[PDB]
Amino acid sequence: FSRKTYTLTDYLKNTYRLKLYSLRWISDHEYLYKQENNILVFNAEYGNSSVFLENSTFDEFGHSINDYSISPDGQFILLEYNYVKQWRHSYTASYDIYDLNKRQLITEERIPNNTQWVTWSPVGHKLAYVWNNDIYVKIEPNLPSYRITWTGKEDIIYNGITDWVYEEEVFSAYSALWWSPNGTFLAYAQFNDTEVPLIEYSFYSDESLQYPKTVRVPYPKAGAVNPTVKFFVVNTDSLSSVTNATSIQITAPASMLIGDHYLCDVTWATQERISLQWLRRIQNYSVMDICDYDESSGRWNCLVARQHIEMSTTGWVGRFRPSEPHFTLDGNSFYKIISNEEGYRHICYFQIDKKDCTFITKGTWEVIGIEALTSDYLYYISNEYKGMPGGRNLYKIQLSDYTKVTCLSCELNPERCQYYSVSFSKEAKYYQLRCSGPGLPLYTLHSSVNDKGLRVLEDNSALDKMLQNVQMPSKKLDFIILNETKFWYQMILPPHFDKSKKYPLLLDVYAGPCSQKADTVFRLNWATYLASTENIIVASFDGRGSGYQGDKIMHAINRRLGTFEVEDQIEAARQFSKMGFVDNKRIAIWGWSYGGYVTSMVLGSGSGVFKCGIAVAPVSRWEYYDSVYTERYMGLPTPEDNLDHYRNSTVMSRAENFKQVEYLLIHGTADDNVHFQQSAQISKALVDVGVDFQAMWYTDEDHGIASSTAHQHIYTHMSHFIKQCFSLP
Amino acid sequence: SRKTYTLTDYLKNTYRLKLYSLRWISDHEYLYKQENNILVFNAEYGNSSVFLENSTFDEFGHSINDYSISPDGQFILLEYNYVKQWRHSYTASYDIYDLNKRQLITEERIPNNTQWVTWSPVGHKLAYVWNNDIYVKIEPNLPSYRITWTGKEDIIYNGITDWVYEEEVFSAYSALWWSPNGTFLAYAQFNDTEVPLIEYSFYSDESLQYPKTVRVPYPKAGAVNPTVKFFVVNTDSLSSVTNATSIQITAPASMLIGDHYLCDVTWATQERISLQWLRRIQNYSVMDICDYDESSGRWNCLVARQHIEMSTTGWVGRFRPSEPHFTLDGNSFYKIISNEEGYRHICYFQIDKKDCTFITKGTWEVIGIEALTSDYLYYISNEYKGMPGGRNLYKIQLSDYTKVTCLSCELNPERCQYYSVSFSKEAKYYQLRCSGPGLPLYTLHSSVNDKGLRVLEDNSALDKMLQNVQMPSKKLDFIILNETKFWYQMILPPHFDKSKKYPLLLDVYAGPCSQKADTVFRLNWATYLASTENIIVASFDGRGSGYQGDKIMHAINRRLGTFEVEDQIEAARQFSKMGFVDNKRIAIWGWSYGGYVTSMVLGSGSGVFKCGIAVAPVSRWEYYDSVYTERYMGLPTPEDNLDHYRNSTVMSRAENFKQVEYLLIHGTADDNVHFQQSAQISKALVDVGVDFQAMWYTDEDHGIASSTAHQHIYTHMSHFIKQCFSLP
Ligand SMILES: *[C@@H]1O[C@H](CO)[C@@H](O[C@@H]2O[C@H](CO)[C@@H](O[C@@H]3O[C@H](CO[C@H]4O[C@H](CO)[C@@H](O)[C@H](O)[C@@H]4O)[C@@H](O)[C@H](O[C@H]4O[C@H](CO)[C@@H](O)[C@H](O)[C@@H]4O[C@H]4O[C@H](CO)[C@@H](O)[C@H](O)[C@@H]4O)[C@@H]3O)[C@H](O)[C@H]2NC(C)=O)[C@H](O)[C@H]1NC(C)=O
Ligand SMILES: *[C@@H]1O[C@H](CO)[C@@H](O[C@@H]2O[C@H](CO)[C@@H](O[C@@H]3O[C@H](CO)[C@@H](O)[C@H](O)[C@@H]3O)[C@H](O)[C@H]2NC(C)=O)[C@H](O)[C@H]1NC(C)=O
Ligand SMILES: *[C@@H]1O[C@H](CO)[C@@H](O)[C@H](O)[C@H]1NC(C)=O
Ligand SMILES: *[C@@H]1O[C@H](CO)[C@@H](O)[C@H](O)[C@H]1NC(C)=O
Ligand SMILES: *[C@@H]1O[C@H](CO)[C@@H](O)[C@H](O)[C@H]1NC(C)=O
Ligand SMILES: *[C@@H]1O[C@H](CO)[C@@H](O)[C@H](O)[C@H]1NC(C)=O
Ligand SMILES: *[C@@H]1O[C@H](CO)[C@@H](O)[C@H](O)[C@H]1NC(C)=O
Ligand SMILES: *[C@@H]1O[C@H](CO)[C@@H](O)[C@H](O)[C@H]1NC(C)=O
Ligand SMILES: *[C@@H]1O[C@H](CO)[C@@H](O)[C@H](O)[C@H]1NC(C)=O
Ligand SMILES: *[C@@H]1O[C@H](CO)[C@@H](O)[C@H](O)[C@H]1NC(C)=O
Ligand SMILES: *[C@@H]1O[C@H](CO)[C@@H](O)[C@H](O)[C@H]1NC(C)=O
Ligand SMILES: *[C@@H]1O[C@H](CO)[C@@H](O)[C@H](O)[C@H]1NC(C)=O
Ligand SMILES: *[C@@H]1O[C@H](CO)[C@@H](O)[C@H](O)[C@H]1NC(C)=O
């Protein structure tokens, strides 16, 4: 007692750093690692390394290097510079190519300035880039590029890149280019936003700008005209300087052309077979096409008999979208995470020209991901171990006997490590395990043959020593029983926690569909500061709508957002208050985006449980949020469908009940995702009913509020608000 | 132990000031609206007749927003479907009711979404503007004649002003001027083709899925300004077959050299218009005098008749060149001009003679010329007891300029030191309007012997109510800064005690030619703060303030955010040195220019002010409109005054806000001081790591004047000031 604590300045200035081990596999036995601006090549088997690229090589380059991409064949390296961020994944940059053999920059036929995407072929040294929404291909870095599409037009026709909604909610990527495994075929999507309405907002820029700029983004809100999609494939081997490149269109199924549809997944099975998944605008019916190259005709035929249909009666298909297929090397079969009869997600074995699939996994738990596939074994992550949904462990199923299941991670360090992710080598000969809690992160390399522990890569020993000197908070992960169902919660407990003493409680909420805020992960965040320094219990709760516990829980919120997930956060806090170590006169709630929505809906409930709370960039009314995400859970806002609950599930309609609570409303003006609009309507509804509240806008900040200064400012302002709400010095 | 003047009393408007709004329709009669009845009153004897009974428009179907009766009392305009645009501009539907026939005009009705309507000054001719084009109706029932065809939304404005002309030049949407007999209709044409657009989000009702973007032609400081043309049309010679001929009056040669404004339009006679023009650099103004040639049908503006008004110390006029007051023949006029000593006084101009003769002199200013007869010119000034914040009606004998008589001074010198006036058509009777320091008092008088005829409204009903309330007193006095008198007021709490120490809120505006220390009686937020919370609300008139000579007003020329900021600090500093104020609890607040000066004071690092509130503040002068900014600052070029434009920003003083508690408030739909200005303040404070309170108001303009928003802002500002001064 009476020693150092984890301060707000420690969180903001990043005094206590987590070390990472970010490696990129270049073959079955070698990986690359960036260390003090030197790129090293490492041998997985023996552990030896050499300087692949010297940090001194690009000293007289004349530009600040943002990122590196080396060609699969290790002959060339892309230098990314002049990085200008757009949305979450999208950005623009200039690119130069450096010949490693010749040790010199390619000066002729250069990649243009303001390039939108670049990618190597997965083998060799071929480049496909996007510039002014049009796709270009280079066979050699030094030779001229071949233009593939001519239809590209800013904010209208997107060739090889996503529009706003496809980027954020479908592909989680700017890229809509897919090379074939050998690099013969370049598959691309085309998005058409002609009839899609624009979100318009002011961007104020530097002081020097006299007239504010208006930003105009094609953004389909709930029920609005969506973008249309086409899918094309091009033969890269037969490109001539004389003739234009011939792009063969793959049409979507007849069952999708009936109405509005999305292209939600693209996976190459072999060199001559593409898997395309399509999803109806009502996201309860999805169709997987298997499309084969006709070697004579030069076409792509997608037999109707080969189609695999995935549908839901209880809600929507998949966690966020239809799950990724993992093909056997021959491409005549694949593995896919599917919801079983009991509503739990498990691996299903599909054979191409045979009906149904065979479930290879079962039980009251879920497979999170399929990570690798050999002839002998399929490697997957799940939350099976100790029946803890918030835990993650790497498992291995013998394909010759599905009963032979081996945990590879569970017992490596069972007190320190209960949350693993994995990175396999090109043919899964070695894997990197990445532990992220409940102890400090631990990065370890393994051999697939015997599942032997080779090496430790990073153990965070330097950090461990420093945090021994600091009064750090403990993390309790447990459950409470509501209507005979286990629901999991966590509490960031202050140092030297005392069950006799009564503590003020902040409820940290997200609570979106398929979310998890009660897990075994180690975080140095704002909650650490609040517990360490200010002696606040920061609790999170996974109620109805939360993921990784079966559809019974996750689909409970179907067509009914801002109901059970709101009710359950109130009931969680109420049950925490009835525990002996919580001061029921000092219970707060805060969250971001969906967290902001649920925070606002709880404060507007009239429960009496919550004294104060903070909504950062909240959703206020579901008609204001994008089509793909909102319609997944709510359907369309028509009288025929679910308009009644769209209108019944707003923050604005609960304005009267904010008289009983102290509310802080925060939002960035340049939020391209949850538009400032949503907070603008909350504030106006509170003004209209005569409710006092604190507010704070952030000029030109997006959904992150992630600029160094803005990040420091919001957490400082939010700290002051929570401190004064709980009567703390 | 009586009740106090609460915040609820201010916001729900418990204690109402009664008015007496009259419109003179002749030399001896005025119109007065009472319980939705319009009455005609006889000025001499005081008897009345019901002109329009309130029951007449019960089955009309729409809510009537305003009434306008024709000069000849034969028709009445019914204004309904009122949709407000900017401060003066709005759109409405109009019906005309025939008083003779006792029936609504059913045929050839005024269009829906009409932008302006006005009667001829005599008879029953109507001129209206619709889709930015002027129309004329000779009879209400007959079809209208189209005058202009060039009108186009946001581009060509015929007969109506654009944004900047409305707000900063004419203080009116109307750019339409009839001749004294209804013969000629003069109009201005504004061209906003190359004027850049301010763009801001309007979120509207909850139901609207996609926010609207509002696009307004708005010239910021240094930007491309609107161009102006001036036309005159003969309404007597309008044909149903042939198009109407508009004769252009060209601006003087000294204005066409560069960028200019049309700043005043005044008919002298039936055959004469006076136009005033102002250069974009507002140190040079030209009055033109234009006569109708009956033979050619042209308007000729002889070069020798031109009158030039210029300033070396600053800008022309208080805000613009002053209006001329013509003698009945129109061969002479009177005009308030700055004299050799820098004080504003009446100057006698004869049309074909150079220069003018000064009729008034002294260390005080003429505010306005109110009426003109063959015998007397009636004017308001601040002469009485050498009080700049006092206003009184005077009368000067035109046959002997030494014979000056105060008509208002001695009517009730304890109750009334602030008068405005409304004369009848030929100045036979006048309504005096007292505004303070006591309750407002409305009295009618006869010009002949200056006899007090009648009391119209004395606010006796209010007097009774305020006896039950612990009301705050007002002290108006001065302090000595560099051997100069500068005036201040203080709203002192009830049962004020000079032995006890009180917290002080400094209420600031301090814009060029402003006055916040006066003798006017106000029931406002300051009344609540003094009555209930026992706070001294002080205001101070420093360098830049008006009605005290150019030496003071022009001290801030090309130097905004300097001396007016310094002097508010020094005023507060001197108030702290008084024994009855707590120097550890001094706050500052203001709106627009007040918000700018509040921000600049808090960013000074003086240590005088603990906290303050900037509502809809200007942050950088490059963000505010051309006409206002360039009047005081010149152009933002390296050639001119860009150095001080860049040195006079709130953003550059961000570091010093670490030492103070700052509340920054702004409406998102502010068309005047754009939300931009607060958006750049906030970003600069975040960028240098300064904590501050903030509050935006969705879809509120510069007023923040909607019932709910008004209640909310003053509640939020109350909570902030209370917690800053540690008040129960
Ligand atoms: C991205 O997505 C948008 C739509 O969301 C799409 O733009 C649309 O393109 C179609 C097809 O080109 C347009 O419909 C055509 O319009 C023309 C006339 O164009 C003018 O008028 C329309 C409104 O009426 C405007 O929108 C447009 O801007 C122009 O001002 C019609 O003449 C076309 O009719 C033909 O097709 C019919 C059906 O086959 C025939 O029956 C008819 O006789 C016409 O025949 C012509 O085409 C035949 C093709 O087989 C040919 O055989 C004939 O000989 C003859 O040439 C047609 O209705 C639609 O208006 C556009 N909408 C919008 C909002 O822009 C983009 O093209 C798409 N972009 C990409 C790259 O995929
Ligand atoms: C409102 O103001 C704008 C200018 O701000 C006027 O538009 C301008 O009109 C002139 C007319 O002389 C155009 O110049 C001419 O252009 C043609 C070619 O189009 C050329 O052949 C002629 O010799 C002459 O130079 C000018 O281009 C045009 N500018 C713009 C920006 O449109 C407009 O006429 C004004 N409208 C009214 C009703 O007063
Ligand atoms: C570059 O590499 C050298 C040798 O490994 C090392 O000493 C130096 O710190 C590096 N330079 C940096 C980090 O700028
Ligand atoms: C590792 O050692 C072997 C044998 O000396 C060598 O050939 C190989 O290049 C080394 N690998 C790396 C990555 O340096
Ligand atoms: C990118 O911009 C710079 C600066 O204008 C220019 O020197 C360079 O040539 C441009 N890049 C290409 C590929 O043309
Ligand atoms: C390729 O197609 C485009 C039309 O989209 C055309 O401009 C171009 O001439 C074509 N190229 C050749 C070589 O024919
Ligand atoms: C709407 O919300 C109210 C209040 O939460 C609830 O009583 C009602 O059941 C909801 N459902 C419908 C269909 O209106
Ligand atoms: C109409 O006028 C009479 C006085 O003539 C007044 O007493 C009455 O209240 C008025 N009614 C309305 C509805 O304004
Ligand atoms: C006032 O009284 C006189 C005499 O009866 C009358 O002629 C006049 O019309 C009255 N005026 C009004 C406005 O009622
Ligand atoms: C104005 O609109 C109303 C309907 O709102 C219509 O009855 C009327 O005819 C319109 N007036 C004119 C003069 O066009
Ligand atoms: C009046 O001028 C307009 C064009 O400005 C035209 O439409 C109309 O025909 C003209 N009428 C006559 C009689 O010249
Ligand atoms: C009004 O004055 C003008 C001056 O030109 C004249 O033409 C017209 O006849 C006069 N009208 C009346 C009604 O006296
Ligand atoms: C700028 O403003 C500062 C205010 O502290 C003043 O000291 C200085 O004299 C001014 N000079 C210029 C060029 O702004």
Residue numbers in the entry:
A (entry chain B): 38 to 766
B (entry chain A): 39 to 766
The article reads:
The dipeptidyl peptidases (DPP) 8 and 9 are serine proteases of the dipeptidyl peptidase 4 activity/structure homologues (DASH) subfamily which cleave post-proline bonds two residues from the N-terminus of a substrate. While DPP4 and FAP are extracellular or secreted proteases, DPP8 and DPP9 are located intracellularly to the cytoplasm and nucleus. There, they play important roles in diverse biological processes such as pyroptosis or ubiquitin-mediated proteolysis, turning them into promising targets for chemical probe and anti-inflammatory or anticancer drug discovery. Here, we show the exploration of the natural product Sulphostin, a DPP4 inhibitor, as a starting point for DPP8/9 inhibitor development.
We therefore also determined an X-ray structure of DPP4 after incubation with Sulphostin, which confirmed the observations made with DPP9. Again, covalent modification of DPP4’s active site serine S630 with a phosphosulfamate group, the product of a nucleophilic attack of the active site serine coupled to a Walden inversion, was exclusively observed, thereby indicating a general covalent reaction mechanism of Sulphostin with DPPs. In agreement with the previous IC50 measurements, these assays confirmed with a kapp of 36,963 M−1 s−1 the preferential binding of Sulphostin to DPP4, followed by DPP9 with a kapp of 317 M−1 s−1 and finally DPP8 with a kapp of 11 M−1 s−1.
